[PDB]
Structure formats: C-alpha cells, structure tokens
C-alpha cells in the first residue's frame, strides 16, 4: 500500500518531460501496433473513412526504472500526463477523437526495467483520395500514415512490434462496409522529407473493392431494358405514326429520368465516370431510334415493310451488343 | 550530458517573460512564414468558402533563447510553447479553424543555438472565398488566405515568405473533386493606415472548374431534346396526334431536366450561364410546338375563309439554334 505510494512519488523526482529519453545519446525507438475494432463507413462524397483502433506504443525510458515488490506499475492518466510520450500523429487524419467516456481511454504501464507501454483507444477519420474514373467498377487502397510530428529521423524512429503483416490486426467482425469489400491490408514503413527534416512514416493500406450488384440492378439493367424497348418500336407497322412517335418520346423521357436518378446516386464530381459514358451511349441509342423513325416516316407514301426498318432491326441490336462487349471487357478486365 | 541540457533549458526559461516580444525596445522582429499544404477539400459554392489543412511554420530570432555548448537543435515538447512568446498571427478570412490534437496537440517548438525559434502548427481552417458564379460552370475562382498580426504594427513585427516563391509547397499535389488548381501566388504587403502599417501575407489560388460532367449531364441532353423537337417539322401537318404528342413531350422532358438539375446542382439564387442555356432550349421547344399550332390554325381555321411554313422552319430552327449556340459559347469562353 504505502510502498506503491512511495514508488509513485519517487518516480517523478527530477524527471523532465520536456526531454525525450536518451536525448543527445541515442535514438528513441518506438514499437507500435494497431488492433482495428471496426473499419467504419467509407464516405465517397467526402473522400474519407472512419476507423476505430487500439493504438499501442512501447519504448524504453531509463529515467523511470524502479525497484519494488511489484513488477509492473499502472499509472493514473494524471500521472501519465507528467511523463514524456511520443507525439504520434496521423498524416492523413482529418478529425480524430480520443475517447474519454466515461474516463480517458488511455493506459500507461511501466515495467521494472523502464519499458513503457502506452495503449489508447482512438476513432480516426482519414482522407482516402479516390480515382472514380472506373466507377462503379473501381478499387482503392485507402492509406493510414502516422508518425512523429516534431522529432526527425535522427531522434525518434518507429518500428512494428512484430512482423509488419501481423502487427496490424483486424477483428473478424471489424468490417462495417455497405458499398465496399475489404480484401486485405498491406503494412509498410518509409521516409518522408519536409521543410523541417526527414521523418519516419508508418503506413497501412486497406484495399477496398466496390460492390457492383446494386448498380447493375438499379441502373444498368433498366437502361438496357429501356434501350431494348426503344428498339422494339422498329417492329411496329410504319402506318402507326402516333404510336411510334409516342413510343419514341416517352422512351426518351424514361431514359432522362433514369439518367438523372443514376447521377443522383453518384458523388458530386465533375469528371466523367464509366457509368456516365454508359448512360450517354444509351441516350444516343434512344435518340437515334427516333431519328430513324422520322426517316422511315419521311418516305411512307398496301405499304411494304420499310427497308430502313429492316436494316435497323439488325443494326441497332448489333451495335448495342458490340458496345456492351467493348464496355464490359474494357472495365471488368482492369 | 542530459542533465546539462536540462540545466541549459532551465536557464533559458528562468526569467523569460512571455509578455515581451524579442527586441522589445528595438527593431521589429522579422517573422518568416512557410506553409506546407496537405489537402484542399469541401470547396463550397453555397457557403462561399473552402477548407484546407496545412503545416504552418514560423521562424523568428529571440536572443533570450540563445544557448551555447550544445551543437544540436533542441526539439522540445510542444507544451513548452505555452512557456514562450509566439507571434499573434491570425487568418483574416478564417470562419472556423482548429488545431488537431490526436494523439497530442500537433505543434512543434525547435530551438537553435543562435536563438532562432521554429514554431510549427498543423491547422485545418475553413477560409471564406467570395465567388462570382455568373459564368458557372465555365468559370474561374480566386480564393485567398490572409495572414495578419492582430495587435502589432510594422514597427513591432514584420512578415516575409521564408524561401521566397518556394515558401508554399504541396500545391501541385492537390486534387480537388470539381476543380483544378492552375496557379498560386504569394503576396507580401503592408496595410497602410493612419495609425500605422500592418504586415500582411496573402496566399492565393486560381481554380478552374471541370466541364466534363456538365457536358454529359446538362448540355448534351438538352441539345438532343431540342433536336428531337425539330422532328415535328418532318411529319405531315395532318398527323395532329403525333406532332402534338412529340412537341408537348419534349416540353415535358425539358422541364424535367431543368427541375432535376435545379435540385441536383448547388442552390445559387441568381442567373448563371447554365440557367440561360436551359431557358434558351426551353424557349426553342416552346416555339417549335407553337409553330405547329400556327400551321394547324392556318390549314383548318382560316382554311375556308401550309407546307411553306414547315419548309421555312426546317431551316430556320436549326440555323437559329446553331447561332444561339455560337453566341453562347463565344460569350462564356
């Protein structure tokens, strides 16, 4: 009882938290590992994702060696604020939260030999730049880069506690993704240079593939059916001018409605995606089926089946099938 | 060794008064600033502001913090910033800003033996940017960031870009969703007033809006609908059901496109180039339907008391619409 209090009071006598351990003598090596409790939602509109992690950091501080009956000392967060800790920050973090409900979710442990373990529970919102040119058949590698903010490569170096593949552990039920599929993660470390010097950066990349079935049912299938419906009018007799005219214009309106809804399901970007080109081609096909009828009607003087209609019943399904094969082989083979 | 550094730091912080600037009674302290831009995001036309995250470094010399006998630059804990003097630098057009604090407050204090102090901050700030969208979406924007000292004139403090034109880095690595940074500029100037001159730094960009999405979703469908409304001119005048249904369905389609682009696009309550083009196409399909109404009245109403008007329209409508496009694209480009 009183021995613990004595050791706690004796620990901080003469300690200076403003100085890193081994200042001017060696490099402070920090061993880190991450346990991801949940890989939260990925926001396409904001180009960011949320992740809930248990961040663990271990290092050696000779100034905190103690001798006593106990082998491990557990520090109160108030006492943990009086001891130097690495200033680890996330390079691509946008707005992170250090949970303190109902108490600060931090834990500092000291072994008898002066080795400190610092575990904290964090919710990190990090930016994931995306190339949406192949939307909705795109794949991304959302990064998570962290490192020291103030200490250069010559002062503090980060390392993974175990082999890098096994250092970052994701829970079995961790994935909380509706639109993506977490294929895996790669763990690596590198060196960056800024105007303040060289820094060590620890990076983890999570590889996500978007689910395509939703866009197939909501957008691709209705567009294909609408184009087939527009080409169906080629089999009506040429004397039904109001019928084929209403068919053409209402198919154009249906395609316009589908295009607008399909765009409303895509984040607001100003470049052209793959679905934008698919919709534009379907729009061109529906427009052409009506220009074709206008050309058939311009020569309708019993009347025979128009040779324009006969050629269009073959050309339009063939041209649309060729476009479909080119489009899918273009994007499903990347 | 380490105890020597501890006593050197104690001597430096012994008697230091954070209420006095360096060279309090002498020449102004020159403060060099550089910015490393990490990313730009949420360029909002509705709120007329943009959000950027940057590493903001400030160098200045304080002879009170000069130490000898240590050949190393002393990078100290960030909380020592609360024990020193730092410039009262604020962003004039900032609306909401904060310093990241995970896992700790993202700031740095590096001391050099000659007394030079490096004070770095990681700041995410939402800066106001008044945008002129009369040419939207064929527009350019100029968004700035003003850096000023709150309570010090040029007699007390001075600002300059450390490194000159290379002070700001990371601009070319930015990738905005619907923009494209063309160029950026650095301006150092004094705001001259009767009381005195105040230092000011200005970082400005030039944003060029991408047009591909607007081409595919706004202009091309409206052009196709307008061309479809001309099909009525190649149908016999006695096909009342076909020509009326085509005309009024093209009017309905144009209305659908206008209203859905109104909902999809940001709420900008004044006339833009996109609104002018959509209104022009709506007028063209309106006149295309009114032409048929005139033809039908000529043939059936004033008959007892019609291919010429259609032949005339088959040329005038494509020609007038092409001239309208020529004037539109020459005006806004």
């Amino acid at each position, epitope marked *: 009882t009183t021995v613990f209090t004595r050791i706690l009071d004796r620990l901080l006598d003469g300690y200076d938290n403003r100085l890193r351990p081994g200042l001017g003598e060696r490099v402070t090596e920090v061993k880190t590992d991450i346990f991801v409790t949940s890989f939260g939602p990925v926001s396409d509109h904001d180009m960011e994702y949320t992740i809930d992690v248990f961040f663990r950091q271990s290092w050696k501080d000779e100034r905190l060696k103690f001798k006593g009956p106990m082998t491990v000392l557990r520090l109160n967060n108030l006492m943990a604020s009086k001891i130097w800790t690495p200033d680890t920050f996330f*390079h691509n973090g946008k707005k992170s939260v250090a949970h303190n409900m109902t108490m600060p979710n931090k834990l500092l442990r000291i072994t008898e030999d002066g080795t400190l373990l610092y575990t904290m529970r964090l919710t990190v919102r990090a930016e994931c730049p995306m*190339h949406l040119e192949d939307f909705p058949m795109d794949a*991304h*590698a959302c990064p998570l880069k962290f490192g020291s903010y103030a200490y250069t490569r010559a002062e503090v170096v980060y390392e993974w506690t175990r082999e890098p593949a096994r250092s970052v552990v994701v829970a079995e039920d961790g994935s909380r993704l509706n639109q993506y599929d977490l294929l895996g993660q*790669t763990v690596d470390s590198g*060196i*960056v*240079q800024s105007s303040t010097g060289e820094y060590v950066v620890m990076t983890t990349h999570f590889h996500l593939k978007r689910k395509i079935g939703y866009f197939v049912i909501q957008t691709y299938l209705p567009c294909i059916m609408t184009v087939i419906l527009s080409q169906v009018s080629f089999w009506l007799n040429r004397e039904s001018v109001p019928a084929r005219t209403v068919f053409g214009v209402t198919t154009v309106l249906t395609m316009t409605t589908l295009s607008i809804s399909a765009r409303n399901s895509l984040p607001k970007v100003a470049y052209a995606t793959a679905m934008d080109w698919f919709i534009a081609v379907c729009y061109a096909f529906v427009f052409s089926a009506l220009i074709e009828f206008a050309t058939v009607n311009y020569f309708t003087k019993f009347n025979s089946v128009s040779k324009i209609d006969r050629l269009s019943r073959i050309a339009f399904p063939l041209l649309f099938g060729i476009f479909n094969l080119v489009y899918w082989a273009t994007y499903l083979n990347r | 060794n380490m105890s020597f550094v501890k006593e050197t730091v104690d001597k430096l912080l012994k008697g230091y008064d954070i209420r006095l600037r360096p060279d309090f009674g002498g020449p102004p302290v020159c403060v060099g600033m550089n910015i490393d831009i990490a990313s730009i995001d949420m360029v909002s036309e509705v709120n007329m502001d943009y959000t950027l995250t940057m590493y903001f470094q400030q160098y200045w010399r304080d002879k009170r913090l000069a130490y000898s006998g240590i050949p190393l630059n002393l990078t100290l804990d960030n909380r020592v910033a609360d024990q020193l003097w730092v410039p009262d630098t604020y962003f004039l057009n900032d609306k909401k800003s904060f310093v990241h604090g995970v896992t700790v407050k993202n700031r740095m204090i590096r001391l050099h033996p000659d007394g030079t102090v490096l004070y770095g901050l990681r700041i995410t700030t939402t800066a106001a940017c008044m945008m002129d969208l009369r040419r939207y979406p064929l527009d350019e924007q100029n968004c700035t960031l003003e850096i000023e000292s709150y309570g010090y004139t040029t007699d007390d403090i001075e600002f300059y870009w450390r490194g000159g034109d290379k002070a700001v880095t990371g601009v070319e690595r930015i*990738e905005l969703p619907q923009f494209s940074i063309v160029e950026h500029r650095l301006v150092s100037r004094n705001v001259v007033f009767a009381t005195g001159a105040y230092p000011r730094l200005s970082l400005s960009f030039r944003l060029k809006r991408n047009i591909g999405y607007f081409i595919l979703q706004t202009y091309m469908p409206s052009i196709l609908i307008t061309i479809l409304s001309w099909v009525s001119f190649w149908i016999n005048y006695d096909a009342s059901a076909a020509r009326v249904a085509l005309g009024i369905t093209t009017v309905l389609t144009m209305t659908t496109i206008n209203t859905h682009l109104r909902e999809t696009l940001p709420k900008i309550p004044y006339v833009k180039a996109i609104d002018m083009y959509l209104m022009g196409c709506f007028v063209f399909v309106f006149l295309a339907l009114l032409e048929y109404a005139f033809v039908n009245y000529i043939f059936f109403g004033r008959g007892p008391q019609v291919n010429a008007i259609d032949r005339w329209s088959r040329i005038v409508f494509p020609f007038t619409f092409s001239l309208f496009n020529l004037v539109y694209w020459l005006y806004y480009v």
Partner: nanobody
Amino acid sequence: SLRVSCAASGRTFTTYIMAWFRQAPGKEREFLAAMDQGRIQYYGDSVRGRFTISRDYAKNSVDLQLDGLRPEDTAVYYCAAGAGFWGLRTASSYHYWGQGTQVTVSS
C-alpha cells in the same frame, strides 16, 4: 553517381504511386523504390540508403539517383506507375510500365 529520369505523358500521375523496378537477367523483377502522392518514400532492403527517388509533380516525372553502384545492379530498370492495389511492392499492382533502360556496371 548516375541519375535516371522517367517522363510521363498522356496522363497526369499526381495522385499515382510512381515506382522503379529492377529485372536481373532471367531471375525476376525486383522492387527498388517508390513514392506516393504524399511524398512518402519506400525502398527495398538491398537499396536502402543507396538509391534516392524524387518526383517532380510539376513536370510529371520521376528521377532515380544511383550511388555506390555494384556489378550486382547490372540489370534492366523499368519505370512503373500505379495505384498500389494489393501492395505497392508487387509488380502486379502497376499497370503503366516504361519501355525500360539498360544499366551496365563494370569494375
């Protein structure tokens, strides 16, 4: 000291990971260095501290600085650019590949 450049045309690689790869005669394709959008530099164990990778985002190009060259480095050098899907060190993750450059070292 040898400097090797790699000019990229037809596409801006501002937000792509640009890497260098070495292919010994008949053995395999070996990862040497890489740099992503955030200027983070990655290097292989055999070339750690020896080779320097730098990206000119304005000119859209990537340069490699080779120092302390050895006869073991005599191989074909390629320039690669990709999104780093399923590891930025695997050659299968890169799509755009340069025609290659031959470097011969004699001692």
